[PDB]
Write a protein that binds this DNA or RNA. Structure first.
Ligand SMILES: [K+]
Ligand SMILES: [K+]
Ligand SMILES: [K+]
Ligand SMILES: [K+]
Ligand SMILES: [K+]
Ligand SMILES: [K+]
Ligand SMILES: [K+]
Ligand SMILES: [K+]
Ligand SMILES: [K+]
Ligand SMILES: [K+]
Ligand SMILES: [K+]
Ligand SMILES: [K+]
Ligand SMILES: [K+]
Ligand SMILES: [K+]
Ligand SMILES: [K+]
Ligand SMILES: [K+]
Ligand SMILES: [K+]
Ligand SMILES: [K+]
Ligand SMILES: [K+]
Ligand SMILES: [K+]
Ligand SMILES: [K+]
Ligand SMILES: [K+]
Ligand SMILES: [K+]
Ligand SMILES: [K+]
Ligand SMILES: [K+]
Ligand SMILES: [K+]
Ligand SMILES: [K+]
Ligand SMILES: [K+]
Ligand SMILES: [K+]
Ligand SMILES: [K+]
Ligand SMILES: [K+]
Ligand SMILES: [K+]
Ligand SMILES: [K+]
Ligand SMILES: [K+]
Ligand SMILES: [K+]
Ligand SMILES: [K+]
Ligand SMILES: [K+]
Ligand SMILES: [K+]
Ligand SMILES: [K+]
Ligand SMILES: [K+]
Ligand SMILES: [K+]
Ligand SMILES: [K+]
Ligand SMILES: [K+]
Ligand SMILES: [Mg+2]
Ligand SMILES: [Mg+2]
Ligand SMILES: [Mg+2]
Ligand SMILES: [Mg+2]
Ligand SMILES: [Mg+2]
Ligand SMILES: [Mg+2]
Ligand SMILES: [Mg+2]
Ligand SMILES: [Mg+2]
Ligand SMILES: [Mg+2]
Ligand SMILES: [Mg+2]
Ligand SMILES: [Mg+2]
Ligand SMILES: [Mg+2]
Ligand SMILES: [Mg+2]
Ligand SMILES: [Mg+2]
Ligand SMILES: [Mg+2]
Ligand SMILES: [Mg+2]
Ligand SMILES: [Mg+2]
Ligand SMILES: [Mg+2]
Ligand SMILES: [Mg+2]
Ligand SMILES: [Mg+2]
Ligand SMILES: [Mg+2]
Ligand SMILES: [Mg+2]
Ligand SMILES: [Mg+2]
Ligand SMILES: [Mg+2]
Ligand SMILES: [Mg+2]
Ligand SMILES: [Mg+2]
Ligand SMILES: [Mg+2]
Ligand SMILES: [Mg+2]
Ligand SMILES: [Mg+2]
Ligand SMILES: [Mg+2]
Ligand SMILES: [Mg+2]
Ligand SMILES: [Mg+2]
Ligand SMILES: [Mg+2]
Ligand SMILES: [Mg+2]
Ligand SMILES: [Mg+2]
Ligand SMILES: [Mg+2]
Ligand SMILES: [Mg+2]
Ligand SMILES: [Mg+2]
Ligand SMILES: [Mg+2]
Ligand SMILES: [Mg+2]
Ligand SMILES: [Mg+2]
Ligand SMILES: [Mg+2]
Ligand SMILES: [Mg+2]
Ligand SMILES: [Mg+2]
Ligand SMILES: [Mg+2]
Ligand SMILES: [Mg+2]
Ligand SMILES: [Mg+2]
Ligand SMILES: [Mg+2]
Ligand SMILES: [Mg+2]
Ligand SMILES: [Mg+2]
Ligand SMILES: [Mg+2]
Ligand SMILES: [Mg+2]
Ligand SMILES: [Mg+2]
Ligand SMILES: [Mg+2]
Ligand SMILES: [Mg+2]
Ligand SMILES: [Mg+2]
Ligand SMILES: [Mg+2]
Ligand SMILES: [Mg+2]
Ligand SMILES: [Mg+2]
Ligand SMILES: [Mg+2]
Ligand SMILES: [Mg+2]
Ligand SMILES: [Mg+2]
Ligand SMILES: [Mg+2]
Ligand SMILES: [Mg+2]
Ligand SMILES: [Mg+2]
Ligand SMILES: [Mg+2]
Ligand SMILES: [Mg+2]
Ligand SMILES: [Mg+2]
Ligand SMILES: [Mg+2]
Ligand SMILES: [Mg+2]
Ligand SMILES: [Mg+2]
Ligand SMILES: [Mg+2]
Ligand SMILES: [Mg+2]
Ligand SMILES: [Mg+2]
Ligand SMILES: [Mg+2]
Ligand SMILES: [Mg+2]
Ligand SMILES: [Mg+2]
Ligand SMILES: [Mg+2]
Ligand SMILES: [Mg+2]
Ligand SMILES: [Mg+2]
Ligand SMILES: [Mg+2]
Ligand SMILES: [Mg+2]
Ligand SMILES: [Mg+2]
Ligand SMILES: [Mg+2]
Ligand SMILES: [Mg+2]
Ligand SMILES: [Mg+2]
Ligand SMILES: [Mg+2]
Ligand SMILES: [Mg+2]
Ligand SMILES: [Mg+2]
Ligand SMILES: [Mg+2]
Ligand SMILES: [Mg+2]
Ligand SMILES: [Mg+2]
Lengths: 118, 114, 123, 56, 209
RNA sequence: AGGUACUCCGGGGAUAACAGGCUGAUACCGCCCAAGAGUUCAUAUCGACGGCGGUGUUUGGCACCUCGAUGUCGGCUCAUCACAUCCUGGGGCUGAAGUAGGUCCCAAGGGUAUGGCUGUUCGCCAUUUAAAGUGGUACGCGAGCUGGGUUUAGAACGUCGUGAGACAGUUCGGUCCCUAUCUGCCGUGGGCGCUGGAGAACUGAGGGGGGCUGCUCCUAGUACGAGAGGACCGGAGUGGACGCAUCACUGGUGUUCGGGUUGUCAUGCCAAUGGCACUGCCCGGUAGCUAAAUGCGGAAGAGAUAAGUGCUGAAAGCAUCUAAGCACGAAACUUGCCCCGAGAUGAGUUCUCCCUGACUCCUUGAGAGUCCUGAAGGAACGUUGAAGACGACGACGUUGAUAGGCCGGGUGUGUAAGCGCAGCGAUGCGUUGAGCUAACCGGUACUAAUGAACCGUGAGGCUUAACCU
RNA sequence: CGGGUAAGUUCCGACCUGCACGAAUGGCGUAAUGAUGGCCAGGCUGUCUCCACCCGAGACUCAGUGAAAUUGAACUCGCUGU
RNA sequence: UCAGGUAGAGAAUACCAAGGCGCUUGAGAGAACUCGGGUGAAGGAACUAGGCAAAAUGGUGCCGUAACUUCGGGAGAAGGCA
RNA sequence: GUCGAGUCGGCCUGCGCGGAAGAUGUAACG
RNA sequence: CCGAACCGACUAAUGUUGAAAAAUUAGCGGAUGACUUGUGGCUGGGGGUGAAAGGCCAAUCAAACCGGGAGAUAGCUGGUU
RNA sequence: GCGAGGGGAGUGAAAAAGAACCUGAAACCGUGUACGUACAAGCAGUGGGAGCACAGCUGUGUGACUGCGUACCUU
């Protein structure tokens, strides 16, 4: 049973999952749109959108939290200097997912995920 | 959740004093022996607190007549007549289960000055 | 929560120091004895000139347990060890004359009133 | 564990009576580009619900 | 004696003044609305059909809406029947409230138990496990033997095996009625009842009593 | 003349060891006669000398099946039946005062120990229990587990033998394979049917589950008894074991939350952080799942009975429970309780909803085709769920709280960072119960749930009644 | 027979009635040594009472590739009998 | 044959350098059951042929250490403190 | 003594009754 | 003596149409010696070699492998249009 | 896909003689049509037999329902 549980295992262990979404969150902030599998995209929302919410309040402590969660200073700078202000009046929902068919190699269901003002 | 909130709010005590893990508290509980009702004191260190609304509880540890005893009180129970802090303790942890392996000098808790 | 093979301390001055439960009395397949339950015991350690000897088989009433007792409001009382009071195998009256440490109100019955009266504290 | 008797071609077909594929019920038509597409998916040219959502 | 349809709100406790904590299941019983009365002449048996709660119009089909409209009542979230005793009478469109239980001491509560999915024999039927060690090969939670030998040469019907567990109708009998609160549409029964929070419950006066 | 357990080939179920079969001497269980025992008294209880059966349970006889293989003793797991009944229920007789027994009859609903020793089954012992039943099921169960014993190859002792070797003598060591086609069984779907289509609520043929019991108290120290002792009947409470549900409480888990900390590498460095070391090691803990947690259950009642007890009553002027007639009588039976259930093809009922076009051809009929039409509803797709292996089932799709985010709260952890102060410094203190906080609660259209398209039709056979036209 | 255990067909100490020990196919002892055989205790624990939860890899679904033993023929049910 | 850094007695071990790699099916899901692991209330060998497996102990310095002995041992006995 | 027409128990013989408990399911007329 | 490399193989689980015709994983023994290892040499089938298990002598051992006597013989089993 | 493979064109008496090449059997696997088949229990046939389709009352195909019916070899 998994009654009321949240989060996808994605056939990984916990440290792999955490590292993967740290990399993928960085790619989405950097490129503003990426293509990935539909389940990974849905999981990425719960990682990236709290980072943008954090970036709405610029302070030393918040930059350090964001650095702790991304480990990339170029990503932290873009979060606080660009994305935070771009989304300052939006109450959540900073990303959108667009389904785009099936991967050739393994028939995986694919999707684009982008920032909503891209 | 408003229905159960209303049912729980009307039963909650309004005079529970503030206390922390590490404090020494005295709890007065009702004891019935036949037709008579009287208050019995239980005084010791608060080693755990469960904050859960009407279901709040706290655990008090004492060494009584050569034996360690723990009592888990249900905070809003009418069996508990009153609670009072005798001494304020200075600890770091929320739960002081490590005191179960300590006696005498090793089980002392520094006083919290404030 | 006492079962066969559980070792218990002795809360009296009968002379026994350590006893082992060898039967939970009072029912087929009965698993556990708690506070206020009668068990069969064997004496595993005794003081030299006491009233009972190592290897004796007799009865006892459990008076303190680590699992504890629940009260009608949901509260719990737990002790640091398991302890019992030795009883005569036939009359089920205590063998010692003194009781050590606290006991609980679960003993407040006609059968164990002597224990209640001798105890230094009843919780 | 293994069969004692060779199953027949009839029984083989009966087992496969649930294997047939199902065609897509119907495709959707983009209101701007007129492309057909899987419903709730973008078109081959990058439209969704009439908006050019992605380049190429 | 008829029952009422309610909703499992959750569990809590009622402290009494004498120091007892009573665990209770909180059941919300909104007004049950009589949608059809069945009788011997037309239906061969005596019962009422009730509805309760509310339903959004665009999820009410035309066959359902016409049935509610004939009774003159607003659509509820479902329909349930209760057989009538010999001296019981109701009329279509009548509302029945939780005050029905005002003087009822004990009730039976029926619900759909929580779903455990596919369950093994240890959990489903309380089978004992085999050795964790002492040489056991791949057979720690498995069922063991399932029959005899050449006689009878088959497995008997009703053999206890793994399969779906829970998610089925269950009745718990003879629960104390702790409080009837008609102003808040509340029924408080002592103890637990089947089903998850939010699920439908059927409450009737206890059959054993 | 011998050995082979270091072994080998050709054969045999022509022929043994296991299990089946036939048989029933033997075994076990009934019964008949009644010498006697029992103060008297054959029959309360035993029953000598002898007699007659039943079972298929023992030890055996036979050699019919299997030697181109039907794996063994014991344990473990899971059972199922019989009744010659161990407990509980009902009863007759007693050498039955009571309590407690003896013996026989009825009764198979449910229940029916844990340990020490030994490979043990068994048995003895310790301590329980209402009781610790007897048997059948390949001495039930190794394509379910074990492998201690028996029964390969190593080695030794006693013993036998000149010796190789041997011994249901002993001793230490010694590979247990199989991905389930069919039957069966547990679950879960798809198809078509049920006669116009569709959405619901049902009826209940039939099936399954459940059915155990202790102790204390009252009745009552009453009845009984010289005392010692000590009830029936009836009532109340509280347990054991078992079962179902649940998570409010008490707790476990909680690699998705917070903190402490060792070694090391990195982010330029300080400070702050991250990676790796079993989650590095640990301390706490939310939701969920859960037992040790806490609610509930076994029934009462009814019907027809078993053994047994009777009423009235002749045959047979009496007597007689029986022949006619009438009445009691048990956990067994049929119900009552819970669940499934119309594929119940004997395919049932009730409520509601929907469809009221045109034409042509033919072999002329429950015929075929084209045009127009496309309902109720369904499905699909999407967002999903204390629903779930997949199907299925439930919620929701902008006329929207379905999921994520967001806002507020709760909970958990336990006073973040930065700055300042004190101290030589480790560190302490202030800002500060701070900061962070999953699955929780209450809100909120910010994101994603698209207009459509698809399936499903167009008033529903014949015959005969009844009623009206 | 004694010891150990509530209880000990094993173990230890004895007795001698050695079925069928016995002196280099050596007798009786023996400190140390042994992945050697037997027995007991402290610690320790999911071995067990009695299992619960969790993390991973399979099992399950989708896409790609794609085996095996076996097989007289099958329209391959229960029971009681034969 | 060669043998860097930090910790370390070390060529053990942990994390790294130079250098080299992610192991030639993937994507989901988050049932039973199997495999490899983590934690567990109360009890603590009751398990079993047998404590099998697991849990546990574990370093350095110092204090201290019995029977027995072939005088070497036994001995890191045991136990304890920092 | 009353009561007023049958009564009693051997033998042989036909058919029946009890004696009569078993294991997956009626299951000892197919 | 403790313990890596190196040489072994006591226990358990897995695996048993294996990743492997003897392994993997966690533990285990020896580890300056009757030690271990490279290269080359020698011993030949009733023969070798053997700290001895009938062990080993190319995945073969109570008498190796290959070819020949050879279509050994088969009072046995199968089959025979 | 500057593929594989194929369709045309052309050669030839013939290309279902196209190089995976004379003939091209059987097992085995398909597409199309006719009839049967979703209340029915077993060596699957045989005797009886309705209905439907087809070709000219008959011939062919199918076979509802029903009596009977446990393969072959060896030993
Ligand atoms: K269960
Ligand atoms: K010979
Ligand atoms: K031999
Ligand atoms: K016989
Ligand atoms: K016989
Ligand atoms: K008899
Ligand atoms: K044989
Ligand atoms: K049995
Ligand atoms: K009885
Ligand atoms: K009797
Ligand atoms: K019975
Ligand atoms: K043993
Ligand atoms: K024996
Ligand atoms: K057998
Ligand atoms: K086996
Ligand atoms: K066996
Ligand atoms: K078998
Ligand atoms: K079969
Ligand atoms: K039944
Ligand atoms: K809980
Ligand atoms: K919890
Ligand atoms: K670090
Ligand atoms: K009479
Ligand atoms: K129907
Ligand atoms: K939301
Ligand atoms: K601070
Ligand atoms: K601070
Ligand atoms: K806080
Ligand atoms: K000699
Ligand atoms: K000597
Ligand atoms: K050894
Ligand atoms: K030894
Ligand atoms: K390392
Ligand atoms: K799955
Ligand atoms: K050398
Ligand atoms: K040799
Ligand atoms: K060779
Ligand atoms: K030779
Ligand atoms: K040709
Ligand atoms: K061909
Ligand atoms: K036929
Ligand atoms: K043959
Ligand atoms: K033969
Ligand atoms: Mg959720
Ligand atoms: Mg995978
Ligand atoms: Mg890690
Ligand atoms: Mg066969
Ligand atoms: Mg298929
Ligand atoms: Mg579920
Ligand atoms: Mg068990
Ligand atoms: Mg194995
Ligand atoms: Mg295993
Ligand atoms: Mg030998
Ligand atoms: Mg042979
Ligand atoms: Mg035999
Ligand atoms: Mg026999
Ligand atoms: Mg024969
Ligand atoms: Mg013969
Ligand atoms: Mg046979
Ligand atoms: Mg064979
Ligand atoms: Mg067989
Ligand atoms: Mg009987
Ligand atoms: Mg019966
Ligand atoms: Mg009954
Ligand atoms: Mg022992
Ligand atoms: Mg033993
Ligand atoms: Mg057997
Ligand atoms: Mg048996
Ligand atoms: Mg078998
Ligand atoms: Mg197996
Ligand atoms: Mg063995
Ligand atoms: Mg060995
Ligand atoms: Mg096996
Ligand atoms: Mg269906
Ligand atoms: Mg039943
Ligand atoms: Mg809760
Ligand atoms: Mg907790
Ligand atoms: Mg934890
Ligand atoms: Mg630093
Ligand atoms: Mg690194
Ligand atoms: Mg590394
Ligand atoms: Mg009754
Ligand atoms: Mg008469
Ligand atoms: Mg009863
Ligand atoms: Mg389902
Ligand atoms: Mg807090
Ligand atoms: Mg910090
Ligand atoms: Mg918050
Ligand atoms: Mg003895
Ligand atoms: Mg002894
Ligand atoms: Mg001896
Ligand atoms: Mg000798
Ligand atoms: Mg000799
Ligand atoms: Mg001599
Ligand atoms: Mg000699
Ligand atoms: Mg000699
Ligand atoms: Mg010697
Ligand atoms: Mg050695
Ligand atoms: Mg596949
Ligand atoms: Mg059969
Ligand atoms: Mg180094
Ligand atoms: Mg290394
Ligand atoms: Mg799953
Ligand atoms: Mg898993
Ligand atoms: Mg496991
Ligand atoms: Mg562990
Ligand atoms: Mg534990
Ligand atoms: Mg803990
Ligand atoms: Mg513990
Ligand atoms: Mg212990
Ligand atoms: Mg034992
Ligand atoms: Mg045992
Ligand atoms: Mg071990
Ligand atoms: Mg370990
Ligand atoms: Mg050391
Ligand atoms: Mg007769
Ligand atoms: Mg029967
Ligand atoms: Mg070797
Ligand atoms: Mg190894
Ligand atoms: Mg050594
Ligand atoms: Mg060494
Ligand atoms: Mg030669
Ligand atoms: Mg030999
Ligand atoms: Mg070889
Ligand atoms: Mg030879
Ligand atoms: Mg010749
Ligand atoms: Mg030849
Ligand atoms: Mg070409
Ligand atoms: Mg030619
Ligand atoms: Mg050709
Ligand atoms: Mg062909
Ligand atoms: Mg039928
Ligand atoms: Mg049909
Ligand atoms: Mg069939
Ligand atoms: Mg026939």
């Amino acid at each position: 049973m998994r009654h009321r549980k949240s989060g996808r295992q994605l056939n990984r262990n916990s440290s792999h999952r955490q590292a993967m979404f740290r990399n993928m969150a960085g790619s989405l902030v950097r490129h503003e749109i990426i293509k990935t599998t539909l389940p990974k995209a849905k999981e990425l929302r719960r990682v990236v959108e709290p980072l943008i919410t954090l970036a709405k309040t610029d302070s030393v402590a918040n930059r350090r939290l964001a650095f702790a969660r991304t480990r990339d200073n170029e990503i932290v700078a873009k979060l606080f200097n660009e994305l935070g202000p771009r989304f300052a009046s939006r109450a959540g929902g900073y990303t959108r997912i667009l389904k785009c068919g099936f991967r050739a190699g393994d028939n995986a269901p694919m999707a684009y995920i982008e920032l909503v003002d891209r | 959740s408003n229905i159960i909130k209303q049912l729980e709010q009307e039963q909650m005590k309004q005079d529970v004093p503030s206390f922390r893990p590490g404090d020494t508290v005295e709890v007065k509980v009702w004891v019935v022996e036949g037709s008579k009702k009287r208050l019995q004191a239980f005084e010791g260190v608060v080693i755990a607190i469960r904050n859960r609304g009407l279901h709040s509880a706290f655990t008090v540890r004492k060494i009584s007549n050569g034996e360690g005893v723990e009592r888990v009180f249900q905070t809003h129970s009418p069996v508990v007549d009153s609670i009072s802090v005798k001494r304020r303790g200075a600890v770091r942890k929320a739960k002081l289960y490590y005191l179960r392996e300590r006696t005498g000098k090793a089980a002392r808790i520094k006083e919290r000055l404030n | 929560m006492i079962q066969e093979q559980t070792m218990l301390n002795v809360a009296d001055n009968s002379g026994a120091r350590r006893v082992m439960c060898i039967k939970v009395l009072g029912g087929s397949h009965r698993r556990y004895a708690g506070v206020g339950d009668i068990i069969k015991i064997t004496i595993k350690e005794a003081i030299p000139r006491g009233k009972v000897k190592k290897g004796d088989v007799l009865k006892a009433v459990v008076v303190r347990t680590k699992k504890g007792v629940r009260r009608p409001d949901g509260s719990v009382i737990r002790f640091d060890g398991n302890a019992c009071v030795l009883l005569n195998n036939n009359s089920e009256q205590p063998i010692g004359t003194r009781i050590f440490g606290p006991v609980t109100r679960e003993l407040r019955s006609e059968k164990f009133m002597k224990i209640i009266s001798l105890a230094p504290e009843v919780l | 564990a293994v069969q004692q008797n060779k199953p027949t071609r009839s029984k083989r077909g009966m087992r496969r009576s649930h294997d047939a594929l199902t065609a897509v019920t119907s495709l959707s038509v983009d209101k701007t580009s007129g492309e057909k597409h899987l419903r709730h998916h973008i078109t081959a040219d990058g439209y969704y619900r009439g908006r050019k959502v992605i380049a190429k | 004696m008829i029952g009422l349809v309610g909703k499992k709100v959750g569990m809590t406790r009622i402290f009494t003044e004498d120091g007892v904590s009573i665990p209770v299941t909180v059941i919300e019983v909104e007004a049950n609305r009589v949608t059809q009365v069945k009788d011997l002449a037309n239906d061969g048996y005596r019962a009422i059909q009730v509805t309760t709660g509310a339903k959004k119009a665009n999820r009410v089909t035309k066959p359902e809406a016409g049935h509610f409209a004939k009774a003159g009542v607003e659509a509820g979230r479902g329909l349930w029947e209760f057989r009538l005793a010999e001296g019981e009478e109701f009329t279509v469109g009548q509302s029945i409230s939780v005050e029905l239980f005002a003087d009822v001491k004990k009730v039976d509560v029926t619900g759909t138990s929580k779903g455990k999915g596919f369950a093994g024999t240890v959990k489903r039927w309380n089978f004992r496990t085999q050795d964790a060690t002492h040489g056991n090969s791949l057979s720690h939670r498995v069922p063991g033997s399932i029959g005899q030998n050449q006689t009878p040469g088959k497995v008997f019907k009703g053999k206890k095996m793994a399969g779906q567990m829970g998610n089925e109708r269950v009745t718990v009998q003879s629960l104390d009625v702790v409080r009837v609160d008609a102003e808040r549409n509340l029924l408080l029964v002592k103890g637990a009842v089947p089903g998850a929070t939010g699920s439908d419950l059927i409450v009737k006066p206890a059959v054993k009593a």
